[PDB]
Amino acid sequence: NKIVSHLLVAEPEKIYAMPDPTVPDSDIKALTTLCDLADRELVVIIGWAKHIPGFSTLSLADQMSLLQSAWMEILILGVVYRSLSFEDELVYADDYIMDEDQSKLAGLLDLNNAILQLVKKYKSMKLEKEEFVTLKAIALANSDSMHIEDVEAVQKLQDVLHEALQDYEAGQHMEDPRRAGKMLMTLPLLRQTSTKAVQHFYNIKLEGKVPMHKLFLEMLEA
Ligand SMILES: OCCC/C(=C(\c1ccc(O)cc1)c1ccc(C2CCN(C3CC3)CC2)cc1)c1ccccc1
C-alpha cells in the first residue's frame, strides 16, 4: 500500500522526556515534565502531518482547524501504542513510564485508567504498526472541527485514508473480513479520553499550583 507505506516511513523518531533526578518528585514535576514533552511532540506532529496525502493542500485555516481538534487524540494514540507490550503502565517515552502508583502521585489515576482501557483493547486486537499510523492519520482527518470551510476536500481526505486502511486489511488480514471496521470502532474511545484529558487542564488551572505558559492559559480561557 502506497499510503500505508509512506506513513510508516514518516513515523517520527523517539522523543525523550529528559526527567531530572535532582528536582524532587511531585505532582508539579510530573506535570511540567509532561507539558515540555508534549510541546516537543506537537512540533513533530506538524512536520509529520505534511506527509499525509492531501493534508498540505488544504487552506491554512483548514489545516489549523483539523489540527486544533485532533492534537490530543494524536498524542494519546502515541502513548497507547508505545504501551502495547507493557502491563498497566503508560509509556510516555522510553525514559518516562507511569505505573498506577505514579499516576496517583500525579493526579492522573482516573485519566490513565481510561487510557489503559484503550491499551487493553488494542492489545487483544494485536494492533500492528501499519494500523497505528493509518489510525493516527484518520484521527486527524476525522477530527470533526466545526470550522472547516472545504468540507468536500476533508471528506475526500477521510476517504483516501479510510481506503488505505481497508485495502491494507483486505490483503494482510483475510481471516478477519471486518478488521478495518473493528479498528474504526475504537475511535469513539480515543475521542472520549482526549476530551477527558483536555478537560483536566481546567482542574489544573483552577488549583493554580502547577505553572502553565501564559499563552496556554489564554488559550484555555478562550
Ligand atoms: O495521562 C495522559 C495525559 C498526559 C498529558 C499530556 C500528554 C499526553 C501525551 C503525551 O505524549 C505527552 C503528554 C499533555 C500535557 C500537556 C499538554 C500541553 C499544554 C501546553 N501546550 C501549549 C503550549 C502549547 C499544549 C500541550 C499536552 C499533553 C496531560 C494532559 C492534560 C492534563 C495533564 C496531563
* Nearest residue (CA) to ligand 1, atom 3: 197
**156 in Cβ contact with 54 (< 8 Å):** yes
* Nearest residue (CA) to ligand 1, atom 16: 35
* Cα distances (angstroms) measured from residue 74 to each of 28, 153, 176: 24, 21, 26
- Cell of residue 112, nine digits: 490513565
Cα(139)–Cα(135) distance, integer angstroms: 6
Quick one: angle between helices 187-207 and 109-125, nearest 10?
Answer: 160
Long-range contacts (CB closer than 8 Å, 24 or more residues apart) made by 104-113: 105/25, 105/26, 105/27, 105/30, 106/27, 106/30, 106/31, 107/27, 107/31, 107/203, 107/204, 108/30, 108/200, 110/196, 111/193, 111/196, 111/197, 111/200
DSSP state letter for 71: H
| β 96-98/90-93 pair status | antiparallel
SS3 per-residue string spanning 155-180? HHHHHHHHHHHHHHHHHHCCCCCCHH
Cα(42)–Cα(48) distance, integer angstroms: 10
Give the ligand 1 atom nearest the CA of 42. Answer: 26
Check the CA dihedral 175-180-185-191 and report its sign. positive
Resolution in A: 2.8
Give the ligand 1 atom nearest the CA of 78. Answer: 11
Instruction: State in Å: Cα 154 to ligand 1 middle.
Output: 26
Question: What residue ranges line ligand 1, CB within 6 angstroms?
Answer: 31, 34-35, 37-39, 41, 75-76, 78-79, 92, 108, 111-112, 115, 197, 200-201, 213, 215-216
Cα(42)–Cα(197) distance, integer angstroms: 16
* Nearest residue (CA) to ligand 1, atom 2: 112
Q: Quick one: how far is CA 158 from the chain centroid?
A: 17
**Coil, strand, or helix at residue 24?**
coil
Give the ligand 1 atom nearest the CA of 92. Answer: 11
Instruction: Say which residues have a Cβ less than 8 Å from residue 67's Cβ, sequence separation at least 6.
Output: 45, 46, 49, 140, 143
Cα(32)–Cα(136) distance, integer angstroms: 25
- Cell of residue 85, nine digits: 507490550
SS3 per-residue string spanning 87-150? CCCEEEECCEEECHHHHHHCCCHHHHHHHHHHHHHHHHHCCCHHHHHHHHHHHHHCCCCCCCCC
Q: Quick one: how far is CA 97 from the chain centroid?
A: 16
**139 in Cβ contact with 187 (< 8 Å):** yes
**Coil, strand, or helix at residue 21?**
coil
Closest CA to 2 of 125, 130, 129: 130
* Nearest residue (CA) to ligand 1, atom 27: 38
Cα(112)–Cα(114) distance, integer angstroms: 5
Could you write out the DSSP letters of every residue in 37-52?
A: HHHHHHHHHHHHHTTS
How many helices, marked H, and strands, marked E, lie in the chain?
Answer: 10, 2
Give the ligand 1 atom nearest the CA of 76. Answer: 9
Residue type, 163: E
Count the Cβ atoms, other than its own, within 10 Å of residue 14: 8
- Cell of residue 196, nine digits: 477527558
Cα(121)–Cα(37) distance, integer angstroms: 25
Give the ligand 1 atom nearest the CA of 98. Answer: 1
